[PDB]
Amino acid sequence: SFVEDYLTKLQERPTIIENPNILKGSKIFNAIYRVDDFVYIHIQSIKSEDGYNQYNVIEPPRPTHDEMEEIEEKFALSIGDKEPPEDTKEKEKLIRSILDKILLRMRLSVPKEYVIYHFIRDKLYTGSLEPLIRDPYIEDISIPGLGHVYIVHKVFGPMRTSIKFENYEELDNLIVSLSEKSYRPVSHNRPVVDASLPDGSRVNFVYGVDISRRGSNLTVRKFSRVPTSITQLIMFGTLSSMMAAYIWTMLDEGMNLFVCGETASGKTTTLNAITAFIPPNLKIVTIEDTPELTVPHSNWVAEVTRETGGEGTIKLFDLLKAALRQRPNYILVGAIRDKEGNVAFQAMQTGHSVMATFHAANITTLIQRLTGYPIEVPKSYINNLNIALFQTALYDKKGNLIRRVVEVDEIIDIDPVTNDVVYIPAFTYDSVQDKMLFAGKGSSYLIENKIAVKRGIDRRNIGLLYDELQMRSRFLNLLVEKKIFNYYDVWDYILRARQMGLEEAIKYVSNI
Amino acid sequence: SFVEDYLTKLQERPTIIENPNILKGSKIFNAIYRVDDFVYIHIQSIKSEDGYNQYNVIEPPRPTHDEMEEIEEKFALSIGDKEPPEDTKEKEKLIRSILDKILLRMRLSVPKEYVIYHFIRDKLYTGSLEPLIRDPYIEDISIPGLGHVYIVHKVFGPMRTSIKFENYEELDNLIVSLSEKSYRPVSHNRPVVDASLPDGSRVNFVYGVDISRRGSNLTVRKFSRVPTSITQLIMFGTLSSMMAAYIWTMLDEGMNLFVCGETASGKTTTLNAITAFIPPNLKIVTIEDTPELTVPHSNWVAEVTRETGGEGTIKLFDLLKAALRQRPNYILVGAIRDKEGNVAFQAMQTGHSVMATFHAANITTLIQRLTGYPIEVPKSYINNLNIALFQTALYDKKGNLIRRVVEVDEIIDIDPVTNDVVYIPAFTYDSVQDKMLFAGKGSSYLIENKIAVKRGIDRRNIGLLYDELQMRSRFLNLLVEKKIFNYYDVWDYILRARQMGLEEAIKYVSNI
Amino acid sequence: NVAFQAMQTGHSVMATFHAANITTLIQRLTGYPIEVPKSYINNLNIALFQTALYDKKGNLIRRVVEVDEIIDIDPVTNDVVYIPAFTYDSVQDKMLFAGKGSSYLIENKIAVKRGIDRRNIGLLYDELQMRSRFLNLLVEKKIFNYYDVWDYILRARQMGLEEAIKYVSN
Ligand SMILES: Nc1ncnc2c1ncn2[C@@H]1O[C@H](COP(=O)(O)OP(=O)(O)O)[C@@H](O)[C@H]1O
Ligand SMILES: Nc1ncnc2c1ncn2[C@@H]1O[C@H](COP(=O)(O)OP(=O)(O)O)[C@@H](O)[C@H]1O
Ligand SMILES: [Mg+2]
Ligand SMILES: [Mg+2]
């Protein structure tokens, strides 16, 4: 068969899996896995001098150019007047039929099925890129110009694929047909185009050698349908169970919270994980430039921006303004860096809860950038933001990149005398022991001065809040210990905890 | 009956109740309350796993799809060239008649009265959302995308209803159809629309999967056709009786006044309330992007902008220019933001009084924005605007949201040494004691340089003006004490005060 | 302005800019039409300055005259704080590592990422010295072609510095 045909020509035969997660940290490998019928992936860890491992795409052989052009011809002549009907799925299963009854009397080189696959892949889908689209372990796809297609793999990082573009014309035809298929055709007049693929991936096209001098280029950004969960983050060591419990307590009470950090620090991942702590019967509105977030709540409005060059442009600013008319309980802003930040604080000021990510290493930098142009949050408004957490990518002792929350700050106010932010570090990070340090039971301005007054608690009864905090930490630990990691499983158990109560939920989980 | 039918399919029967107010606090129940003769609501005390109570709409059964198609097509074939009348009642009268003719000769799968309910519901009203609109216990309605319609119920809080939208295009059609019925169609170019349903409920639309990625979404917020009155605003603490008396005095004398603040600070609400102070026999032209102002005056031109995506588009600017030829006494502009601001001041310079809402937190910012791009009011004309009030949202000590007019400024001049506004703060606010402060006696330039001169009172009998002011404050305080809060009742009492004098008015209303 | 937007969204950036020194650079970055607000200026970490100078025979040479690390904003003056990591001694025609042992980017960015205490910073300066040693060896062996040099840098990435140094030394 086509796989074994490939698989026999290899000097050293690759093993079998179907999930390269096992290889995490394995710097040596030679494996092959399924994607679809007609698509297998052979990953081999060569000692490539420029540090790319190999990602080999295994597809059915192609009929000769002559066969195709003959099949194209005979096909084009059919359904002439006839219009290609709307629906994608039952009107794909039509092009099939027509293929059969023009192939059934043809002497073909390769087996028909394999002819079918290539005809369909190129006509109805993303052609040679389709295996990469179909592969759930790929996050970025780049065709920078002439040469190989490059990807970023979640396990392996950047890899070089076996797919190769040798001429400008192939490249052009790819960018043109895909952009047309995405209903946003490129032209020489407007050669730069952003669009969505049917699977929801985002694609950027740049068309014409006069603009992309190594040949027309594209970039596909794919998004995970299943976000990393809060128990995974705890297991990774990125947050402690107590820290996550603290966040849970705060989101349960509608606190406003920014997840901050600099390049690739994991802000969006942490944001998506802690979203599971927002009470499940509430309305969440997400507003993003890029559709990265997946919210488990049923009452979830998900909005994205649109840039048209002028008329019809919809910005984050516009969507946050509209969110004030949408009765949200939480507004989640993908990332703040412009005037939408001002509207976000006005949303906080008028009874709406907000979370967002922001690119900044520490609270001083965060406040300076929020109060500066272009965001222009007034100092008198900064107090609306209750929690700023900062995380960063660091190396561990083995040289591996890890992500860590390095500080969690409770914002109290800006000092009128000094114009400096008054805040309390709720958590800090000890890099030596690799542990999150909790400031403790007498430490939280938010618990004592905000929540206590909210939940109608007297000072004598303040320990009951710290007690529930402790119980939440216990529950999260038990989830981790029982290996409850999948985002939706974790959501289910959070919901269970809310339904039966923490004390009883802990007993239930203890006995799995 | 359609209801009794429904009950028989149930595992166990719910108790019939007059209204859900009795179920309040409780959580072990099972009830059916009546909305219309066609709408009964079944409420289930057993939560879903995500903590939503279930709100089940009991409607009469629908005709088959082919029956409905047959009816629509026949309805369309009758009358199909003629345009329907604008009057909603006459419209419905016509539709029922025509419908009665078509159905008379038909053999229906369900009773006639049921076909009629559903036809009228979908054609004239809000379709499957109509039961929610008609239930007075519904506060908010959300369709966040594909899935159920979610609501906020006055008794039960968030609930999941039995209404579902499972098809992108059907959801698009709903948003398009409802926006068209709201007199403000969405388009792909302008996919975000704020408007009001025919019943007066505010609605926000977001159109197209390219912007709302889980499907077109909407939010309905119910609330009185009766606008909040000035006596209610005093009782809320948003402004004092003296502040209202001041504004009343100023509008009596044709002063120009902007209501300023951030979004959702309550500016439109305050403008609508103080409009009741404009003398009753005057011409009012309102100019808005969507109607919010409910003017009680008889001589009221209500104009609204229009976006067509091409020819026929009419903006605030165009309407404001036309107002110069319409002999209004007051022009009320819903909000001023762009070059229409310049025309508003042209209106002032040609003898028309103007009020508007504007986005600015203080007088300094207001003047910077008026004089800068794109408004560009020349500096020497800025003092045509007499009064700016600034309103903001805040939290009190308990954490409750409140809205307060925090400053009232009289605009005197722009200082040529150099370009700073000369103004007088006639009122300010003490945020600690939550109190409004008057400047006050012999502080107002407008009282003692415009009104006194017109009157024409000497600088030593100026007490007469401040006595009329203290007088108006007492009358307003009296209305609050006697709980005269309804907008139109307050209007009547104001007109009554005009038509027998303050002294006689205070003394009257003291009795009740 | 968009280059700074790119830094603020987690993309690294390099660029050339026509300016003689950090003061001029910052005036131009913060002024019209670039208009980067001061609070974002320190997204740019390093500014290097290079000039055409005359040699003693009156021919043109190019020299890096300063390398500046951009730190943050001074709370008293509202000015951009920077420290020179390198300066140029025109009389000896030598680059001075003025930031040696006191570089902000080395201690507060690099060292922190590596979890290296303020008291073990010497390890980073050791690694730097080995990098320099390697670059000298390439020069000594007349490895000048851009692609040959690129190959050796990659060889150093692979294999590691110490034995790349051994291989080059031969
Ligand atoms: N806690 C973590 N542990 C390990 N990897 C992570 C963690 N958080 C994020 N990542 C990975 O790091 C990269 C950047 O994550 P992202 O959430 O997009 O960061 P940012 O939002 O700060 O740009 C992604 O590849 C993501 O899968
Ligand atoms: N003084 C007030 N007190 C309490 N609620 C108010 C007040 N003014 C307005 N609101 C409510 O606040 C919300 C925003 O009001 P609106 O007048 O539309 O503000 P803006 O015009 O500034 O956007 C509305 O739901 C309205 O009912
Ligand atoms: Mg308004
Ligand atoms: Mg990011």
From Swiss-Prot, chains A, B:
EC number(s) recorded for this UniProt protein: 3.6.4.-
Subcellular location field: Archaeal flagellum; Cell membrane
Membrane topology: Peripheral membrane protein
Summary of the knockout phenotype: The deletion mutant lacks flagella and is non-motile.
Record text on activity regulation: Archaeal, but not bacterial, lipids stimulate the ATPase activity 3-4-fold.
Positions that bind ADP: 238, 264, 266-269
Key word Nucleotide-binding present: yes
Residues that, per the record, bind Mg(2+): 268
One GO CC annotation: plasma membrane
Chemical reaction(s) catalysed: ATP + H2O = ADP + phosphate + H(+)
PANTHER family in the cross-refs: FLAGELLA ACCESSORY PROTEIN I (PTHR30486:SF14), TWITCHING MOTILITY PROTEIN PILT (PTHR30486)
Membership in a protein family: Belongs to the GSP E family.
Subunit note: The S.acidocaldarius archaellum assembly machinery and its filament consist of seven proteins (FlaB, FlaF, FlaG, FlaH, FlaI, FlaJ and FlaX). FlaI forms hexameric rings in the presence of ATP. Interacts directly with the FlaX ring and FlaH.
Domain notes: Contains a variable N-terminal domain (NTD) and a conserved C-terminal ATPase domain (CTD), connected by a flexible linker. Both NTD and CTD form similarly sized globular structures. The NTD is essential for archaellum formation, motility and FlaI localization, but not for ATPase activity. ATP binding induces a conformational change and locks the hexamer into a more symmetrical and less dynamic conformation, which may promote hexamer assembly by stabilizing interactions across adjacent subunits.
Function: Component of the archaellum. FlaX, FlaH and FlaI form the core cytoplasmic motor complex of the crenarchaeal archaellum. FlaI shows ATPase activity, which provides the energy for both archaellum assembly and rotation. Hydrolyzes ATP with the highest rate, but is also able to hydrolyze GTP, CTP and UTP. Cannot hydrolyze ADP into AMP.
Protein name, per record: Archaeal flagellar ATPase motor FlaI
Organism: Sulfolobus acidocaldarius (strain ATCC 33909 / DSM 639 / JCM 8929 / NBRC 15157 / NCIMB 11770)
Classification of source organism: Archaea, Thermoproteota, Thermoprotei, Sulfolobales, Sulfolobaceae
Gene (name only): flaI
Swiss-Prot record, chain C:
Induction / repression: Part of the fla operon, which encodes the seven fla genes essential for crenarchaeal flagellum assembly and function. Expression is induced by tryptone starvation.
Signal peptide from the UniProt entry: none
Compartment list: Archaeal flagellum; Cell membrane
Superkingdom per UniProt: Archaea
Phenotype when the gene is knocked out: The deletion mutant lacks flagella and is non-motile.
Record's subunit section: The S.acidocaldarius archaellum assembly machinery and its filament consist of seven proteins (FlaB, FlaF, FlaG, FlaH, FlaI, FlaJ and FlaX). FlaI forms hexameric rings in the presence of ATP. Interacts directly with the FlaX ring and FlaH.
Record-stated family: Belongs to the GSP E family.
Protein function: Component of the archaellum. FlaX, FlaH and FlaI form the core cytoplasmic motor complex of the crenarchaeal archaellum. FlaI shows ATPase activity, which provides the energy for both archaellum assembly and rotation. Hydrolyzes ATP with the highest rate, but is also able to hydrolyze GTP, CTP and UTP. Cannot hydrolyze ADP into AMP.
Comment, domains: Contains a variable N-terminal domain (NTD) and a conserved C-terminal ATPase domain (CTD), connected by a flexible linker. Both NTD and CTD form similarly sized globular structures. The NTD is essential for archaellum formation, motility and FlaI localization, but not for ATPase activity. ATP binding induces a conformational change and locks the hexamer into a more symmetrical and less dynamic conformation, which may promote hexamer assembly by stabilizing interactions across adjacent subunits.
Protein name: Archaeal flagellar ATPase motor FlaI
Upper lineage: Archaea, Thermoproteota, Thermoprotei, Sulfolobales, Sulfolobaceae
Gene: flaI
